[PDB]
């Protein structure tokens, strides 16, 4: 009477296709850094070394914008004492 | 596509309609109406020296 419900997400994988064409293994390319290397090298076994995988980039959090002075005159038009014909 | 079709011994799964290669070029196709697996070879080319 019990079941499990999960939600799909737009993620990239690396799927290992057998000789018979079936999928025997997979690697989630954002699970951990080791799987990022595995998806970068397109391999399931990585050799000893240092491998560049991605780009860290700090994202901006805020936005920040002379003393706003000179708005034009209407108060002398719309709130004027007297108009013309 | 364009190519030579030959009989092939590649075992597809019962939902896969065409094979592919590690260049992502289609080098096999299951035909419909008989579900045989057919290889695809490029039509033979080369220079003339």
């Amino acid at each position: 009477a019990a079941y499990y419900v999960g939600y799909l997400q737009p993620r990239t994988f690396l799927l290992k296709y057998n000789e018979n064409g079936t999928i025997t293994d997979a690697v989630d390319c954002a699970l951990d850094p080791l799987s990022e290397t595995k998806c970068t090298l397109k391999s399931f076994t990585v050799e000893k070394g240092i491998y560049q995988t991605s780009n860290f980039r700090v994202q901006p959090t805020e936005s920040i914008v002379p003393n706003i002075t000179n708005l034009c005159p209407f108060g002398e038009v719309f709130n004027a004492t007297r108009f013309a014909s | 596509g364009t190519g030579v079709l030959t009989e092939s011994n590649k075992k597809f799964l019962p939902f896969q309609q065409f094979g592919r290669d590690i260049a992502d070029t289609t080098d096999a196709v299951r035909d419909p109406q008989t579900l045989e697996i057919l290889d695809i070879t490029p039509c033979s080319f080369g220079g003339v020296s």
């Binding site: 999960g6 994988f13 057998n18 018979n20 390319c29 399931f44 | 592919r20 590690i22």
Partner: peptide
């Protein structure tokens, strides 16, 4: 309730035969 979903739920995405390959 929650449960870990270990490595489970991978499906064939495209109905393409591929033999002895690692497709991303």
């Amino acid at each position: 309730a929650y449960t870990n979903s270990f490595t489970r739920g991978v499906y064939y995405p495209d109905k393409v035969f591929r033999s002895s390959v690692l497709h991303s």
